[PDB]
Amino acid sequence: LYFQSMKKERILAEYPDGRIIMVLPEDPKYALKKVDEIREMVDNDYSRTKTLLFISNDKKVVGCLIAEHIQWGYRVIEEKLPVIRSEEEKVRFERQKAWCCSTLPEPAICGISRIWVFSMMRRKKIASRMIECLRSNFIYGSYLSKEEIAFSDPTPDGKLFATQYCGTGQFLVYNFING
Amino acid sequence: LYFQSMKKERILAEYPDGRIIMVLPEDPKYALKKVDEIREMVDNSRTKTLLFISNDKKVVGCLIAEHIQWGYRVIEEKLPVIRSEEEKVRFERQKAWCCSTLPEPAICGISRIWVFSMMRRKKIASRMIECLRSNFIYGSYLSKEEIAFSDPTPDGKLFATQYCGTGQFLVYNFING
Ligand SMILES: CC(=O)SCCNC(=O)CCNC(=O)[C@H](O)C(C)(C)COP(=O)(O)OP(=O)(O)OC[C@H]1O[C@@H](n2cnc3c(N)ncnc32)[C@H](O)[C@@H]1OP(=O)(O)O
Ligand SMILES: CC(=O)SCCNC(=O)CCNC(=O)[C@H](O)C(C)(C)COP(=O)(O)OP(=O)(O)OC[C@H]1O[C@@H](n2cnc3c(N)ncnc32)[C@H](O)[C@@H]1OP(=O)(O)O
């Protein structure tokens, strides 16, 4: 139940249901303390980072995405494994999902260190729109590809989000099992 | 750089290079204060904490265990891939570690496991896990198949694959739960 008030603000996007503002390290102390508390609050589930925030019309902070510079990520790949049975049993074509993290470091630009959305405003495209803004705004004048972003230490929510967001059952990660 | 003092502790094994003791939720207030300070630096109720203390009196390893019902299998594979080098293509295999979505029953969750950096590769983590197997459920000796590891790090992955013997191991608080 945390709120946030302008003192300027810097809007990257406006919508029927709210706004996405960005906050940078150079911003007033008032902004830096709020990202902090929001950080702390999100942790229940610094240097050249950028923080995105989705603010409901209410002024309530309902989205947060913290992003950092990186050089490398590791691909996670959706596989669906065949279940083979004994020759005396009947055959079924149900596959079992598995998620495979490649050990090969592939090139990357933008590491999503944190990405959170308030439990009861989920599946409303908030996280998608935040990344969409991260992409247009991580580098001034560039539109990052889906592959230049990696997600730090995916939770299962993150996995299911990332996969659908990027298409093709793949996404890059870091702070994970291969590095 | 924490030191534990010999008191009358619950000692699970003695070794030439030190000992392993255990701290339970309802222990004396000293014990639980010490475990908490070991918790913090490591990270730079229904649980059990195992400490490896060297003859030097130093806290050299920490193992925090936990009850659980479910784990997910992680296994190394070589995935068919295409290597593309400006127009030119070849077929190859990429090493990857695969986590199955299938829940499997597990009893004991290694929520933390840690050995002080200078003391690694001296079988301290292996031993902590041995003390754990024969001190988790009374009158019972845990199978490797009944142990799972919380959110493994790359170090923990390299340890578990070898410690578990099969090239496979179970996890939780990971990408599938
Ligand atoms: C921190 C990291 O780097 S990764 C971990 C991310 N942080 C967390 O896990 C904290 C708790 N969870 C969350 O905050 C949220 O679940 C997030 C950030 C992962 C997703 O937030 P949302 O705003 O609900 O995602 P969004 O609406 O943009 O998702 C769009 C699509 O992604 C997929 N998706 C997102 N979350 C889920 C889910 N929990 N289960 C299944 N599919 C999902 C769906 O296809 C969804 O489309 P649909 O609703 O039309 O069927
Ligand atoms: C929180 C969790 O649940 S998982 C995360 C585990 N903890 C951490 O990541 C903290 C940092 N790392 C660690 O503290 C340690 O490396 C631990 C706890 C993973 C292992 O501690 P150790 O006492 O060095 O393990 P141990 O000595 O019993 O290793 C036995 C075998 O596992 C394998 N192994 C253990 N560490 C490694 C490694 N870093 N690289 C490659 N193989 C390894 C080796 O085969 C080793 O046998 P060997 O030395 O004869 O070749």
Torsion of Cα atoms, A156 then A158 then A159 then A164, to 10°: 130
| Three-class secondary structure of residue A33 per DSSP | helix
CB A172 within 8 A of CB A147: yes
Nearest Cα to B124, choosing from B132, B115, B133, B137?
B115
Q: Which long-range contacts (CB under 8 A, 24 or more apart) does B11-19 make?
A: B12/B50, B12/B131, B12/B135, B13/B127, B13/B130, B13/B131, B15/B127, B17/B54, B17/B55, B17/B122, B17/B124, B18/B52, B18/B53, B18/B54, B18/B55, B18/B56, B18/B60, B19/B52, B19/B53
Mutate to test the interface with A, among B73, B81, B95, B97 (most CBs of A within 10 A): B97
Mutate to test the interface with B, among A43, A45, A101, A147 (most CBs of B within 10 A): A101
Report which ligand 1 atom has the smallest distance to the Cα of A122.
Answer: 24
Sort strands A110-117 and B47-54 into parallel, antiparallel or unpaired. Answer: unpaired
Show residues of chain A in contact with B177, CB under 8 Å. Answer: 156
Q: Kind and range of the H or E element at A61?
A: strand A61-69
Helix B154-164 crosses helix B124-133 at what angle (to 10 degrees)?
A: 60
Helix A126-137 crosses helix A156-166 at what angle (to 10 degrees)?
A: 60
Going by C-beta distance under 8 Å and a sequence separation of 6 or more, which residues neighbour residue B18?
B52, B53, B54, B55, B56, B60
What residues does each domain of chain A span? 1-179
The owner of tokens 């008191």 is B7
The owner of tokens 């207030």 is B29
Question: Which ligand is in closest contact with the Cα of B149?
Answer: 2
Alpha-carbon distance B104 to B106, whole Å? 6
Alpha-carbon distance A121 to B90, whole Å? 45
Q: How far is A120 from chain B (nearest CA, A)?
A: 20
Name residue A162's amino acid.
A
| Three-class secondary structure of residue A43 per DSSP | coil
Strands (E), chain B: 10-15, 18-23, 47-54, 59-67, 70-85, 88-105, 108-115, 147-150, 168-172
In angstroms, this model's resolution equals: 2.6
CB A109 within 8 A of CB A69: yes
For B25-53, the three-class secondary structure string (H helix, E strand, C coil) is CCCCHHHHHHHHHHHHHHCCCCEEEEEEE
**Sign of CA pseudo-dihedral A119, A123, A128, A133:** negative
- Cβ burial of B119 (10 Å; 0-12, 13-18, 19+) is middle
CB B55 within 8 A of CB B18: yes
Alpha-carbon distance A107 to A109, whole Å? 7
Of A74, A118, A122, A159, the residue with max ligand 1 atoms within 8 A of its CB, to mutate for a pocket test, comes to: A122
